[PDB]
Design a protein around this motif. Structure first.
Motif, PDB file in Angstrom:
ATOM      1  N   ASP A  86       0.809  -1.218   0.000  1.00  0.00           N
ATOM      2  CA  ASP A  86       0.000   0.000   0.000  1.00  0.00           C
ATOM      3  C   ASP A  86       0.846   1.273   0.000  1.00  0.00           C
ATOM      4  OD1 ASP A  86      -0.665   0.452   3.519  1.00  0.00           O
ATOM      5  OD2 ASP A  86       0.664  -1.044   2.638  1.00  0.00           O
ATOM      6  N   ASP A  87       2.135   1.140   0.317  1.00  0.00           N
ATOM      7  CA  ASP A  87       3.077   2.251   0.195  1.00  0.00           C
ATOM      8  C   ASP A  87       3.663   2.197  -1.214  1.00  0.00           C
ATOM      9  OD1 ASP A  87       5.068   4.178   0.277  1.00  0.00           O
ATOM     10  OD2 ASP A  87       5.854   3.562   2.220  1.00  0.00           O
ATOM     11  N   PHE A  88       3.058   2.964  -2.120  1.00  0.00           N
ATOM     12  CA  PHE A  88       3.339   2.830  -3.550  1.00  0.00           C
ATOM     13  C   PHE A  88       4.770   3.155  -3.952  1.00  0.00           C
ATOM     14  CE2 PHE A  88      -1.317   4.031  -3.456  1.00  0.00           C
ATOM     15  CZ  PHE A  88      -1.764   2.717  -3.499  1.00  0.00           C
ATOM     16  N   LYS A  89       5.434   4.045  -3.218  1.00  0.00           N
ATOM     17  CA  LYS A  89       6.835   4.309  -3.545  1.00  0.00           C
ATOM     18  C   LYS A  89       7.742   3.099  -3.310  1.00  0.00           C
ATOM     19  CE  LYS A  89       7.204   7.366   0.473  1.00  0.00           C
ATOM     20  NZ  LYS A  89       5.841   6.891   0.832  1.00  0.00           N
ATOM     21  N   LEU A  90       7.414   2.268  -2.316  1.00  0.00           N
ATOM     22  CA  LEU A  90       8.146   1.014  -2.110  1.00  0.00           C
ATOM     23  C   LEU A  90       7.912   0.040  -3.269  1.00  0.00           C
ATOM     24  CD1 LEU A  90       7.750   0.325   1.754  1.00  0.00           C
ATOM     25  CD2 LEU A  90       9.674   1.417   0.563  1.00  0.00           C
ATOM     26  N   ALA A  91       6.682   0.010  -3.785  1.00  0.00           N
ATOM     27  CA  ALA A  91       6.356  -0.832  -4.937  1.00  0.00           C
ATOM     28  C   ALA A  91       7.088  -0.325  -6.176  1.00  0.00           C
ATOM     29  CB  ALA A  91       4.848  -0.873  -5.169  1.00  0.00           C
ATOM     30  N   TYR A  92       7.114   0.998  -6.342  1.00  0.00           N
ATOM     31  CA  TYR A  92       7.852   1.626  -7.438  1.00  0.00           C
ATOM     32  C   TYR A  92       9.343   1.253  -7.427  1.00  0.00           C
ATOM     33  CZ  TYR A  92      10.275   5.122 -10.247  1.00  0.00           C
ATOM     34  OH  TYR A  92      11.096   5.743 -11.165  1.00  0.00           O
ATOM     35  N   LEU A  93       9.991   1.368  -6.269  1.00  0.00           N
ATOM     36  CA  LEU A  93      11.411   1.008  -6.157  1.00  0.00           C
ATOM     37  C   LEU A  93      11.645  -0.467  -6.451  1.00  0.00           C
ATOM     38  CD1 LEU A  93      12.733   2.835  -2.966  1.00  0.00           C
ATOM     39  CD2 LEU A  93      13.049   3.519  -5.361  1.00  0.00           C
ATOM     40  N   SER A  94      10.721  -1.303  -5.992  1.00  0.00           N
ATOM     41  CA  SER A  94      10.807  -2.740  -6.216  1.00  0.00           C
ATOM     42  C   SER A  94      10.732  -3.095  -7.708  1.00  0.00           C
ATOM     43  CB  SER A  94       9.704  -3.462  -5.447  1.00  0.00           C
ATOM     44  OG  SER A  94       9.895  -4.860  -5.523  1.00  0.00           O
ATOM     45  N   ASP A  95       9.870  -2.390  -8.437  1.00  0.00           N
ATOM     46  CA  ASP A  95       9.718  -2.570  -9.884  1.00  0.00           C
ATOM     47  C   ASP A  95      10.893  -1.991 -10.674  1.00  0.00           C
ATOM     48  OD1 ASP A  95       6.088  -2.100  -9.976  1.00  0.00           O
ATOM     49  OD2 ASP A  95       7.264  -3.946  -9.871  1.00  0.00           O
ATOM     50  N   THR A  96      11.401  -0.846 -10.221  1.00  0.00           N
ATOM     51  CA  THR A  96      12.424  -0.093 -10.961  1.00  0.00           C
ATOM     52  C   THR A  96      13.837  -0.620 -10.692  1.00  0.00           C
ATOM     53  OG1 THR A  96      10.967   1.854 -10.831  1.00  0.00           O
ATOM     54  CG2 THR A  96      13.224   2.246 -11.583  1.00  0.00           C
ATOM     55  N   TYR A  97      14.048  -1.151  -9.490  1.00  0.00           N
ATOM     56  CA  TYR A  97      15.345  -1.708  -9.086  1.00  0.00           C
ATOM     57  C   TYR A  97      15.193  -3.161  -8.661  1.00  0.00           C
ATOM     58  CZ  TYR A  97      16.530   3.144  -9.377  1.00  0.00           C
ATOM     59  OH  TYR A  97      16.695   4.423  -9.837  1.00  0.00           O
ATOM     60  N   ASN A  98      14.822  -3.997  -9.621  1.00  0.00           N
ATOM     61  CA  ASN A  98      14.605  -5.412  -9.354  1.00  0.00           C
ATOM     62  C   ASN A  98      15.916  -6.195  -9.462  1.00  0.00           C
ATOM     63  OD1 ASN A  98      13.209  -7.780  -8.716  1.00  0.00           O
ATOM     64  ND2 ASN A  98      12.526  -8.116 -10.827  1.00  0.00           N
ATOM     65  N   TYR A  99      16.825  -5.891  -8.537  1.00  0.00           N
ATOM     66  CA  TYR A  99      18.144  -6.515  -8.426  1.00  0.00           C
ATOM     67  C   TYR A  99      18.790  -5.973  -7.156  1.00  0.00           C
ATOM     68  CZ  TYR A  99      19.237  -2.010 -10.725  1.00  0.00           C
ATOM     69  OH  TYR A  99      19.305  -0.677 -11.076  1.00  0.00           O
ATOM     70  N   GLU A 100      19.811  -6.660  -6.648  1.00  0.00           N
ATOM     71  CA  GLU A 100      20.551  -6.149  -5.495  1.00  0.00           C
ATOM     72  C   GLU A 100      21.234  -4.845  -5.888  1.00  0.00           C
ATOM     73  OE1 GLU A 100      23.957  -8.424  -3.841  1.00  0.00           O
ATOM     74  OE2 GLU A 100      23.108  -7.921  -1.875  1.00  0.00           O
ATOM     75  N   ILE A 101      20.929  -3.780  -5.157  1.00  0.00           N
ATOM     76  CA  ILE A 101      21.461  -2.460  -5.481  1.00  0.00           C
ATOM     77  C   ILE A 101      22.938  -2.346  -5.124  1.00  0.00           C
ATOM     78  CG2 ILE A 101      21.378  -0.005  -4.896  1.00  0.00           C
ATOM     79  CD1 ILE A 101      18.249  -0.454  -4.682  1.00  0.00           C
ATOM     80  N   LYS A 102      23.743  -1.991  -6.119  1.00  0.00           N
ATOM     81  CA  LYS A 102      25.131  -1.636  -5.895  1.00  0.00           C
ATOM     82  C   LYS A 102      25.202  -0.123  -6.032  1.00  0.00           C
ATOM     83  CE  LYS A 102      29.220  -3.802  -5.313  1.00  0.00           C
ATOM     84  NZ  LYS A 102      29.450  -4.973  -4.423  1.00  0.00           N
TER      85      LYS A 102
END
Ligand SMILES: Nc1ncnc2c1ncn2[C@@H]1O[C@H](COP(=O)(O)OP(=O)(O)OP(=O)(O)O)[C@@H](O)[C@H]1O
Ligand SMILES: [Ca+2]
Ligand SMILES: [Ca+2]
Ligand SMILES: [Ca+2]
Ligand SMILES: [Ca+2]
Ligand SMILES: [Ca+2]
Length: 901
Positions: A86-102
DNA sequence: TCGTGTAAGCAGTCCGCG
DNA sequence: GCGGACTGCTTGC
């Protein structure tokens, strides 16, 4: 390079994201993100999405975020679960950065700033911002420059430009001693008026827009002051330029009594260093002034000036500006040591959250678990309302108050996370319940085996064994990170002890410290070179080793805190996975484990000693045992040991080769008894404690639960050059106890444990004789001060008024009519002193803001009327009487028949 | 003290305890 | 004076 976000915000139906692109450039974008949520659907309906219990879900795609939020409301109106993030910015980050962030920290703009505001009529309230901003120092991490904005003309005085030449000079040359290493990094900008200063500051901010914004009290003071001052002079639109998206919100922060306002700057991540320090440092300080913390962390002297800060600019503008600059540098120095910014970035990017969310373990774990489940096309449950309910925690054994000569301690590695992993405790792994027997029936292994199918906790809960839950899976990942950093920390610590030993015999030579990685145990070649080094080089190496140890401590202890926070979050009603069945499964298993292993250790040692019913375990708290080793030493006989290190070696070997295998066997049996998924109860030796060989030292003592002292020679494999006291709970460890009293009580304990009764008596007699000479601040008590107004009845104490609040009320009467005198701030800390009968203050104590000298208006009278007798009795004699009676020892020499000669 | 949990210690207030 | 009921504070896990 792989892209990574800097900041993310929801503004209406748009996601605003600042990020680093694949070429390493900072970019900003507005995305009309269409979120998805989920509803349960019929089994017949083909889907790839399932909730955590395996029930099928339909995905619902929304035209916009507002539509999604409105749908959630209507689902509540209907009475049906609305699943998904329900926190859409968390969903956005999950979709946009679907990999371990370096991430690359060199590309992240970290800004450290501090402002000055001259005020003739008291503390300059940020919500009013009625006084000119007359200095800003703003450090930029990308430029590595200190940008100084200096107001030369004010209604409170016109001044000359600050001189960098005077600033660099020693205090003894009349200079300000601005550290030479930053002199060439200062960019100085004087201004003829405040409007031009602020317009230029905003233009600069546009060009170099902070991603991480920090400093000392910036969230509560600097940011709201700057925002409101700009707002007052220019209007709202201009003040909103502090946000890269031109959006701000006044945020009201509420607690138990009263609330306060901060300014949320959309598209900035504010990490106030005071808050970073409070969360990540694991200290509790008597004061949180930057001077106090800088002295503690860095051993730098207090920034000294004459007169009030309200007159510093007009009297000494030169020093005023230099001190503003130094204040910014001090925070950078603290961070170079503690590395809290690095920690926040690590944890933030790991969870895929707004960096400022690292302050919330609930938010952090919500994100980690959501991302993990999303990977498997699983759908998170909706958060629900729950009433706050108490639940049981750990077991703590009641110790017999006594001296304890030889002690070996043991405790579980990451106890609660290990329990979660062993039992397989997770929202979606709940298999059912079994009929519970009294806990002592499990402890003594007389209760019926809970299950032949599922993994069990003695609170009655059963869990699946076929697959790991998401909570065990994710907690293991962070535990493994913790373990790696703890390894580096302990190696640095061991390396430090090598250098300390070498320092006994420094060489008379001119040389350099060795270029080594302190995170790894020194090789033989490095050890040989160290033995030939000068004291100068050795001391520099010791400093570097200790900084490496601190870096490792920060990384490991806060990863430990995060995983322990997950176990705690299961008992917080705001956690998506709140479940008292799971929270209590952890704590009740813990109680069993401690008491089970107490029994097993007692059984083992009675066997090797050929006794029956003897208690070798003297104490335990949550996941630890303290084992009396007197009989083990006595079986060999003290006479057979060459020196202290010889018996330490012997106990170390005994713990490793005999005790730990026995403990492991005991826990393996318990694991089988509970039918757990995996044996993960690893109870390793902590401390080896005892008096120096051939001394009259008592080794250790306990006064009660959570109150003990041990003379430790080896801690988790670190063999000390010099014995170290492990003191827990006693007044030496409490921030409320006066500084000089902590010190004196520590020396009393040192003498008890290492030297004996006669040594303790000699020290007591001297301290009692000399203590009245101690500086008043060093003998003042400390307390947090809440609810001042509640107990204030016309300036006098109301019913049940706490002692420290009484002191504040006394202070308030004494300073009444002064706008300049420092005010006691609700919720902050105060120093407290008792006052003798018939004092002019009219009450039995006085209190003033901690970390400060009491105002000159009353200092001389406070000093004259301080009750040294009461102070000594309350803070020193009473606790010492506690220690000595527990230890069966006298702090004053009793009369004997010899006195007659 | 905006920010995961519980257990438990001691200082102090109020007032009983013949 | 010491304890219990209570508030307040702080620490150990
Ligand atoms: N700050 C805390 N919040 C929640 N639970 C905690 C906290 N501190 C300790 N605990 C609980 O007590 C247990 C034992 O505490 P302890 O300090 O021994 O840490 P640990 O997790 O076992 O790690 P270590 O390996 O350092 O001993 C933890 O596993 C949990
Ligand atoms: Ca200042
Ligand atoms: Ca532990
Ligand atoms: Ca040498
Ligand atoms: Ca422990
Ligand atoms: Ca350990």
């Amino acid at each position: 390079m792989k892209e990574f976000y800097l900041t993310v915000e929801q503004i209406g139906d748009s996601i605003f994201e600042r990020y680093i692109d694949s070429n390493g450039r900072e970019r900003t974008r507005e995305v009309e993100y269409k979120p998805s949520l989920f509803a349960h659907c019929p089994e017949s309906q083909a889907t790839k999405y399932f909730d955590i219990y395996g029930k099928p879900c339909t995905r619902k795609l929304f035209a916009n975020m507002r539509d999604a939020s409105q749908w959630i409301k209507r689902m509540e109106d209907i009475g049906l679960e609305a699943l998904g993030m329900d926190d859409f910015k968390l969903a956005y980050l999950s979709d946009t950065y679907n990999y371990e962030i370096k991430y690359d920290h060199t590309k992240i703009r970290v800004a450290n700033f501090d402002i000055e505001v001259t005020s003739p009529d008291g503390f300059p309230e940020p919500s009013q911002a009625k006084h000119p901003i007359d200095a800003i120092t703003h450090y930029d991490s990308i430029d590595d420059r200190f940008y100084v904005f200096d107001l030369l003309n004010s209604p409170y005085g016109n001044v000359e430009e600050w001189s960098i030449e005077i600033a660099a000079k020693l205090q003894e040359q009349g200079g300000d001693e601005v550290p030479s290493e930053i002199i060439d990094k200062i960019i100085y900008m004087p201004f003829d008026n405040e409007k031009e200063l602020l317009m230029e500051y905003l233009n600069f901010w546009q060009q170099k827009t902070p991603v991480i914004l920090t400093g000392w009290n910036v969230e509560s003071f600097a940011i709201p002051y700057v925002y409101n001052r700009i707002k007052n002079i220019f209007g709202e639109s201009t003040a909103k330029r502090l946000s890269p998206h031109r959006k701000t919100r006044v945020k009201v922060i509420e607690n138990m009594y009263g609330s306060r306002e901060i300014i949320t700057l959309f598209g900035i991540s504010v990490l106030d260093y005071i808050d970073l320090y409070k969360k990540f440092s694991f200290t509790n300080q008597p004061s949180y002034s930057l001077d106090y913390i800088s002295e503690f962390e860095l051993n730098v002297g207090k920034l000294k000036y004459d007169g009030p800060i309200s007159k510093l600019r007009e009297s000494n503008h030169q020093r005023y500006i230099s001190y503003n600059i130094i204040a910014v540098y001090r925070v950078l120095q603290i961070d170079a040591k503690r590395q809290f910014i690095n920690l926040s970035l690590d944890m933030g990017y790991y969870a895929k959250i707004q960096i400022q969310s690292v302050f919330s373990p609930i938010k952090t774990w919500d994100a980690i678990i959501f991302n993990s489940l999303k990977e498997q096309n699983k759908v998170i449950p909706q958060g629900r309302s729950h009433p706050v309910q108490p639940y049981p925690g750990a077991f703590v054994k009641e110790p017999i108050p006594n001296r304890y000569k030889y002690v070996m301690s043991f405790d579980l590695t990451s106890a609660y996370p290990s329990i979660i992993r062993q039992v397989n405790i997770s929202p979606e792994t709940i298999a059912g319940t079994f009929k519970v027997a009294p806990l002592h029936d499990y402890i003594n292994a007389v209760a019926e085996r809970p299950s032949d199918v599922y993994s069990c906790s003695p609170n009655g809960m059963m869990y699946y064994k076929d697959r790991d839950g998401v909570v065990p899976t994710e907690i293991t990942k962070v535990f493994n990170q913790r373990k790696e950093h703890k390894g580096y920390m302990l190696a640095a610590q061991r390396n430090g002890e090598i250098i300390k030993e070498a320092l006994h015999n420094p060489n008379l030579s001119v040389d350099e410290p060795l270029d080594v990685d302190y995170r790894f145990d020194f090789s033989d070649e490095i050890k040989e070179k160290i033995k030939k080094l000068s004291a100068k080089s050795l001391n520099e190496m010791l400093f570097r080793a200790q900084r490496t140890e601190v870096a490792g401590m920060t990384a490991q202890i806060n990863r430990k805190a995060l995983i322990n926070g997950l176990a705690g979050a299961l008992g917080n009603v705001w956690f998506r996975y709140y479940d008292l069945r799971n929270a209590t499964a952890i704590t009740t298993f813990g109680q069993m484990a401690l008491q089970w292993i107490e029994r097993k250790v007692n059984e083992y040692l009675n066997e090797v000693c050929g006794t029956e019913g003897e208690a070798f375990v003297l104490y335990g708290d949550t996941d630890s045992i303290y084992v009396s080793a007197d009989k083990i030493i006595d079986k060999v006989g003290e006479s057979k040991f060459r020196d202290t290190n010889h018996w330490v070696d012997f106990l170390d070997k005994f713990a490793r080769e005999r005790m730990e295998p026995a403990i492991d066997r005991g826990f393996r049996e318990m694991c089988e008894y509970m039918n757990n998924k995996q044996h993960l109860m690893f109870m390793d030796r902590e401390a080896i404690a005892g008096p120096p060989l051939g001394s009259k030292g008592i080794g250790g003592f306990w006064t009660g639960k959570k109150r003990y002292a041990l003379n430790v020679w080896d801690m988790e494999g670190t063999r000390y050059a010099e014995p170290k006291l492990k003191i827990m709970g006693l007044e030496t460890q409490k921030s409320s106890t006066p500084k000089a009293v902590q010190k004196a009580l520590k020396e009393c304990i040192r003498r008890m444990l290492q030297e004996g009764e006669e040594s303790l008596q000699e020290y007591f007699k001297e301290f009692e004789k000399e203590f009245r000479q101690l500086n008043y601040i060093s003998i003042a008590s400390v307390s947090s001060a809440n609810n001042i107004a509640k107990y204030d009845v016309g300036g006098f104490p109301g019913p049940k008024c706490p002692f420290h609040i009484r002191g504040i009320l006394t202070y308030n009467r004494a300073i009444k009519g002064n706008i300049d005198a420092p005010q006691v701030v609700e919720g902050e800390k105060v120093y407290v002193l008792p006052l003798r009968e018939g004092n002019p203050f009219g009450d039995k104590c006085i209190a003033w803001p901690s970390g400060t000298e009491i105002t000159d208006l009353i200092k001389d009278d406070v000093l004259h009327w301080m009750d040294y007798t009461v102070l000594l009795e309350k803070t020193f004699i009473k606790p010492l009487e506690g220690f000595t009676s527990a230890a069966k020892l006298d702090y004053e020499k009793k009369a004997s028949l010899f006195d007659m000669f």
